[PDB]
Amino acid sequence: RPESELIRQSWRVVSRSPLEHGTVLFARLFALEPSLLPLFQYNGRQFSSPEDSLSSPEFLDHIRKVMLVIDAAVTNVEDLSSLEEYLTSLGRKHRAVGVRLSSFSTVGESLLYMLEKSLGPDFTPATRTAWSRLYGAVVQAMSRGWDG
Ligand code: HEM
C-alpha cells in the first residue's frame, strides 16, 4: 500500500512524544464532546472539568494506552484482521464503561485534529485519507463489541 507508508511515516513523528500528542487528542475530544468526561471513573470519582483529567495519572495512562492501540494498528496497517478479536473485545469493554459507539467518530476527529496540528503542512490530503481509513477499520472491528 502507498497509504501504509503515509501512516507509518506520520506516526513516527507522533510516536516521539505520544503523551504530548495524546494530550492534544484528548483535550480536543473533551472540547468537542464534554459528555465523555464522566466516563473516566477512577476511584469512583468524576472529573469536573477537562483540565482535571490532565492531572490524573490514570487518565494520562489511558492516553498512553490509546496511543499504543494506535501504534498496534500502525504496526498492522497492512493486515488489521490480526487485531480483530482484540478490537472486538476493546469495543465490548468501552460499551461496558458507557461509551456509545457514535463517540468513536468524535475520537476519530480528535485524532485527525491532533495529526493536523502536529504535522502542519505534512498532513497532506492523502495522509488524512489514509488515517481516516485506518481509524475507520479500527472502529469497524471495535463495533463488533457492541454486537454489530
Ligand atoms: C470515547 C473515548 C474513550 C473513553 C471514554 C475511554 C474510556 C476508557 C475507560 C474508562 C477505560 C477503562 C479504564 C482505563 O483503563 O483507563 C478504558 C480502557 C482502555 N481504553 Fe479507552 N476510552 C476511549 C477511547 C479509547 C480509544 C480510542 C482507545 C484506543 C484506540 C482506547 C484504548 C483503551 C485501552 C487500551 C484500554 C484498556 C482496556 C482493558 O484491557 O482493560 N480507548 N477506556
Numbering used by the authors: 3 to 150
Article, verbatim:
Neuroglobin (Ngb) is a member of the globin protein family that is expressed in the brain (∼1 µM) and the retina (∼100 µM) of vertebrates. It is involved in the protection of the nervous tissue from ischemic damage via a still-elusive biochemical mechanism. Notably, Ngb is also a hexacoordinate protein in the ‘deoxy’ ferrous form, with the rate-limiting step for ligand binding being the spontaneous breakage of the distal His(E7)64–heme bond.
Moreover, the three-dimensional structure of ferric Ngb (not competent for CO/O2 binding) under increasing O2 pressure was investigated in order to find out whether internal cavities in Ngb may act as storage niches for this small gaseous reactant as observed when using Xe or Kr as probes. Therefore, diffraction data for ferric Ngb (Fe3+) were collected at 50 and 80 bar of pure molecular oxygen. This species is not competent for gaseous ligand binding, but is structurally identical within experimental error to the ferrous (Fe2+) hexacoordinate species that can bind O2 or CO. From this analysis, the hydrophobic nature of the Xe-III site surface is evident, since only two atoms out of 12 reported are polar. Therefore, the presence of O2 in the Xe-III cavity supports its role as a ligand-storage site in the context of a catalytic role for Ngb. Our data show that none of the other cavities previously identified by Xe, Kr and Ar docking, including the Xe-IV site close to the heme cavity [Fig. 5(b)], is occupied by O2 even when the pressure is raised to 80 bar. Indeed, only one (Xe-III) of the two internal Xe sites identified in Ngb hosts molecular oxygen and it coincides with the region of the Ngb cavity network that binds noble gases with the highest occupancy. We therefore hypothesize that it constitutes a preferential path for ligand migration and/or a storage site for diatomic molecules.
